[PDB]
């Protein structure tokens, strides 16, 4: 399974595939792996539907718990710190990928943030512009490397993210590609100054069809 | 001892009478909270959960401790059950349980009077609920308005006359500020609403420029 | 140790006397609970278990805590043994134990008076049991009716004269609403432990269905 | 052993086989694995008679405990959450399948819900329309895949459920088929807006006898 | 037993202990917050750093407020580490001191003979009016906008300051106004500022030679 | 009454200290000098706390010896957990103030003691000696020149105010101290010790018997 | 409760209990320390060994001082094992008794109606003046250079001893002076006698009973 | 990964590479491993970005916690003692500092390393290195240390040691001229610990490269 | 690594090498392994710089802790007892060698003491006159066995200790010989009636140069 995340001038986009496997058998086709956790953040876990939603839910509760108690939300550094404490607590399994927008950053164009975790539960803020986690991560990263120059805005960001996921599916059987028969496409979240939003399914469908048509 | 019960009750009632006043009233768009508060940091009104709000009068350190404990309870319940489990009735019952235990077991009772308000969920038809929880653990279901702290009677009478069952925001705000002055602007007021038209989090603060516009 | 016992007993008796009244009486189809309650949210009558009901008078926060603890006990027992283990006698004994401990160990005794009622299981012949548990842990087995809260004597006497064993629903309800006055739907909470229900005997009679029975 | 569950317009049906084995030896023929847990839910466990009944009993007690304490039953999301806490608690084994009807859902036709659990104790809402757990699950799922288009109402659904169990038995020795000699047939529960009801043995006997005559 | 007589006698015991100790004043100035205390000792500190932009000042019995200073530093460091350095605010520390003093006043044998002041300045490069909090022996918290006076005789120092105060007064000006008003030398003064112009750690002590030329 | 309790406890302690023998501690050119009226050859009233820190006490023995031991335990733990320079007179005095204040408030009987903690400079450093007086209630006072504890303080305090020299020699300061003490004595009834700032590490040194004779 | 009235009443309760019990004297002599006690019982001991060169003597309520004697032996043996045998001194044991009695006087319901004496002699072949410590019901410790008198009526026995004292009494001499000064406020049938003999290699404590005590008096 | 540290007259310099690997795969290119912990100290861990930053953060909090509580900072010996307690409680760090209380300000630079068992060691050789390219870096410094005469030549040698580590160890990253990523460095003298500007390290790295071609 | 210790008429001497290794690699050249622990004792550990210093520090603190609390230092038997308790506590590693002088012994000429520890944490007082611990201990002991007859005082005793360490280095790669290029030589402590003092570097260097000239 694969989750991708990329920074565009003005924000960040995160997208995940829909498949789950039990060895070689396909166990899921509608698996949602990316969830909005607060007004400015989203988490994605390359794991089961349960691990993804349970993790996001607990994290969302903690961010909102702090906000209600203290009156203001945590700073971006504080959000990562709390996520890291949660990840290290569960490890003592799949690694979280966090996308956010630092509302308090000096330059709004580069305020998008991507945070990933290594096997030991250590956080890492990505300065490369993109990141991917899961079984098709290498194929998705390799694809974004050649297509990143095309990312000039939120629309291009979403298009490239979908193409990276497509390339992951094309080379990794554990990652699901767009199912044109059932009408199931990757899920995505875009985060900018106005907050975190779920990208409409019809928008992802259109992009997927254009990529398929282009490669034919 | 019956003498102990009266002296504790008096100690608490006097502490609440010496503090500033707070009023919350139902309106067409939800519940409105208005409090006399010169401080820009120390909050008397707060969000508890999705559709539930908090308002208190009395000694700060005591009601902030209850505000925190309520948020703690609400978040634990919503996570262990569902978000719809947390209701105004539930939080009010918990505050009644807590204050009642303090009044009985602790050396000094809490010099506070609390108000828990709940609005309907998005797209639902339900009349707003307002609860008054007092220092001894007594809970009262008020259908229209709650007045806590300072001198209750002059503000309560002044509201019994000029109230509107489905007043607009601008109307209900002006009616509330009027009853608080007779017993004050952006620099000395804390205002907030439980807006029943918001998708999930109903609590919204009306501060500064936006409040001066509404005055 | 004798002055303390009297002052605690007085503090509690006065708190119960200042609260609204509740009556519980036996009828043809089970037990009927009628309470004077203007609130639509704060319940004074409740289900404990399958054939067991609860009714209380006094300070709300105190009896709701007892209602919750009783439901906790009942569900634990039924799970650890069998559903038939949970009886009215068992729950009443537990409330007597709890109130007696509160009266003796907490700073203020609970300003409550409780009633635990039990009806027969489906298809069985057994006379309904009603128990009165007071603030000090005293338990009394009442065969016909229980009156708690407010002024007991005027309601108890008005019920002693007008009592019929095996009275009908519409009949027993009217007799109960009558005895409560001497001492409408917007000022009442009514419920029955209907012995004709397969498992859960507790049923609330509210609104439209309640207006008709008067 | 196998449990199947499918959504039909306006509701859900859950059915389970009657066998239990101890290696190769048949240890049970009358094993009830599906139980109504509240007015709108039913659980099924592909394990022994004891694991199935003990689990259902504890869960039924938990749902009713909440209703008595709070006055209203848990929302569907709350019921799953409580089940998940119970499943994760027992792992520290055969996993449950929950069938229920969401009384508060906006569209009553699709208010039927199916919930399963994976090896790690993770919940999952099936969106495919059907699901199966146990040693004959693949066979039952592959059978429902081909017959699902025939499901238009409760009786059509029940037919497809009994046929899925028959196909599981036909290919998996651990799943029991309909015993015409002893008169033992799969048990089933149907849940719609009017609540959860045990399907009469005579309706299942009629369906099973006919699937047999059909393949003859 | 009697909850009202005990409340008055405890309150008197504490008020008298604070009245017998030396005075401390905190006031807003253009570049931050200024702390001036009457302290002949070169070792026993009455003013201290709590966190980045937060300062502490106290009056009363030393062993009691030093215990609170230590506990405040312990709290602040734990919070900043568990959340963000920014979680730590003046409002937060003041709330915690209010909670602690209120519990001491209730549970312990003798209440703390102290009066505390928590002050906070803006972060580097940010526009925010300095916040000053007064926390008393019973747990009462008051948001003072201009100045805080603690210990000894409050009224003569408070009145002498109410007349000579200037909102954007420079360091040299505000220092001279503060030294004056206490009276209502370097060998008897402990002076420190929460300089809002420093990158991270705002607290800075003005001692010896540097304090001389400034006085 | 709580104000009555505070006065009676304070009186009980003040009377116990007034009934015990006197101790003086004074700064001299070479360090700090401790002189105590003690007929006992075994029960010590003056002791070493740390390398540059000394202790002196007046009152009930069992009570101040308990405090001397607790102070040595604290000092050794701190020096080991941090560095040897962490241990200062200010630190130990603060700890004694904390301890005595807790005893006075919570225990049934307050400690009938008055303590003195003194500190000299480290080898080769220029620093004025520090002397701290810690009383029964936890009050701490920074005395620049001398400390007088136990018995009748004023006659000894006045006799010292008139006879105090800033950088007095050993033989000089000793004679001034013994004189001050007589207003409220030889080798057999005196316990004398110095915190000699000229020693490499351990400043504490006892002046007993034959060596104390040549100074008197 | 009033902290001053309680302190006086506890002090009185204890002082009266000690005044009602029989007397014990401990005095230095040329060969060590000598303990003399008025005790009719042949089973219940008032004098005992604590460690190598350390002795114990007490006056007051038996159950209370025997509890302290046992606790002292338990402390002494633990210390000597954890450090060295020379760590256990009279000063150390006296300090511990002072700590214990002081805590009892403060925390327990009734204070201990006892008065204790811890004595220490020199190690074999060493020159050191014997040390005697008096520990009282409140935890007060006093270093007595010549003699200690505990229990009963202190003043008449203390004065009769203050006259008749000698710096280096012989055993036969010091014993007679002690029995005599004890007769101001008795023989083999009513006396408990023991010495801390500084001339014994390790264990200084030795009891002088029956036939051997008769010839000495 | 490699961290180097060396003493120069009147100071200390510490530098670290920017790579992180997951076996044979390059997982990071901008990894900061050296952080200032207080006015006079800096720590460097030859591990992941997280281990380096989390360790430095906890240690910095511990040093400042003491300062606020006691009024004065810990002595250098005390700073090492606290670091040692932290290391034994838990990825072996290299500490670089300047003892402001030392008699000779010229030799006041300090370098402390830790062995596998969590034991501290004060380096008296003048330099030290930790990580997978540490032997290459130490052997390089052995031959170039005679050239260190001040802060600038100290920094050149540190950068050259890291270059040599990268040239022989694939786990240590060399200067990326394409992306403009260079080793990070901290220099500590009597005026405190300061981060070395990226421009100065880039200049030294380009000169080392031109000198080798 | 090697530590030697030998008794001479009037005292004891302890010396240790300066090397530390991480396998075959030389990790240290200035390693101090012998430290003075009190006025009359010194400990040596054949381990890392940290184990040697930390052990000595903890033991020195314990000895001084007792002296401050009780007024007098522990007897020699008590010092060993405390050391043994410390050694047994750490093994539930390298074994410590202790050199000391019993100031209370009857014969001052033989008052020097050497105590070693076996793998099980058991103490042993050496009556052979010398002892060694570490990887080169047997070479050092066999060397001292042939040279011990030459020890007649402190100087000849130091000469024999340095020669023992030289022989240890000559046959064991883990023990460091005198580095004439860097000017690094073994450290040594000499203890007699006047206390424990560190032997000057210049004195060890002259003896080492004489041993090297003698072997050439």
PDB file of C-alpha atoms in Angstrom, chain F residues 5 8-9 11-12 15 40-43 60-62 65-66 69 107-109 111-112, chain G residues 2-5 7 91 95 98-99 102 105-107 129 131 133 138-141 143:
ATOM      1  CA  UNK F   5      -1.168  27.265  67.629  1.00  0.00           C
ATOM      2  CA  UNK F   8       2.450  28.301  71.250  1.00  0.00           C
ATOM      3  CA  UNK F   9       4.666  26.257  68.908  1.00  0.00           C
ATOM      4  CA  UNK F  11       7.161  29.640  72.251  1.00  0.00           C
ATOM      5  CA  UNK F  12       7.854  25.934  72.899  1.00  0.00           C
ATOM      6  CA  UNK F  15      12.238  28.249  75.247  1.00  0.00           C
ATOM      7  CA  UNK F  40      31.023  16.666  76.186  1.00  0.00           C
ATOM      8  CA  UNK F  41      33.942  15.049  74.353  1.00  0.00           C
ATOM      9  CA  UNK F  42      31.623  12.843  72.253  1.00  0.00           C
ATOM     10  CA  UNK F  43      28.479  14.806  71.334  1.00  0.00           C
ATOM     11  CA  UNK F  60      18.222  19.586  71.502  1.00  0.00           C
ATOM     12  CA  UNK F  61      20.975  17.159  70.316  1.00  0.00           C
ATOM     13  CA  UNK F  62      18.896  14.310  68.840  1.00  0.00           C
ATOM     14  CA  UNK F  65      22.225  15.599  64.768  1.00  0.00           C
ATOM     15  CA  UNK F  66      19.355  14.256  62.665  1.00  0.00           C
ATOM     16  CA  UNK F  69      23.108  13.696  58.976  1.00  0.00           C
ATOM     17  CA  UNK F 107       4.754  17.451  62.854  1.00  0.00           C
ATOM     18  CA  UNK F 108       3.217  17.425  66.379  1.00  0.00           C
ATOM     19  CA  UNK F 109       6.231  19.175  67.929  1.00  0.00           C
ATOM     20  CA  UNK F 111      12.391  21.219  66.393  1.00  0.00           C
ATOM     21  CA  UNK F 112      14.063  22.985  69.339  1.00  0.00           C
TER      22      UNK F 112
ATOM     23  CA  UNK G   2      -2.784  23.081  72.342  1.00  0.00           C
ATOM     24  CA  UNK G   3       0.890  22.221  71.641  1.00  0.00           C
ATOM     25  CA  UNK G   4       1.981  23.388  75.073  1.00  0.00           C
ATOM     26  CA  UNK G   5      -0.566  21.723  77.365  1.00  0.00           C
ATOM     27  CA  UNK G   7       3.728  18.622  75.971  1.00  0.00           C
ATOM     28  CA  UNK G  91      27.639   7.536  71.211  1.00  0.00           C
ATOM     29  CA  UNK G  95      21.962   8.796  69.478  1.00  0.00           C
ATOM     30  CA  UNK G  98      17.384   9.482  71.536  1.00  0.00           C
ATOM     31  CA  UNK G  99      15.950   9.399  67.984  1.00  0.00           C
ATOM     32  CA  UNK G 102      11.876  11.407  70.638  1.00  0.00           C
ATOM     33  CA  UNK G 105       7.059  11.059  72.531  1.00  0.00           C
ATOM     34  CA  UNK G 106       5.812  12.850  69.418  1.00  0.00           C
ATOM     35  CA  UNK G 107       3.939  10.270  67.272  1.00  0.00           C
ATOM     36  CA  UNK G 129      37.906   7.198  79.849  1.00  0.00           C
ATOM     37  CA  UNK G 131      31.523   7.145  78.586  1.00  0.00           C
ATOM     38  CA  UNK G 133      24.902   8.474  78.468  1.00  0.00           C
ATOM     39  CA  UNK G 138      11.578  12.879  75.439  1.00  0.00           C
ATOM     40  CA  UNK G 139      14.776  12.067  73.573  1.00  0.00           C
ATOM     41  CA  UNK G 140      17.119  14.245  75.634  1.00  0.00           C
ATOM     42  CA  UNK G 141      20.669  12.999  75.794  1.00  0.00           C
ATOM     43  CA  UNK G 143      26.867  13.048  78.672  1.00  0.00           C
TER      44      UNK G 143
END
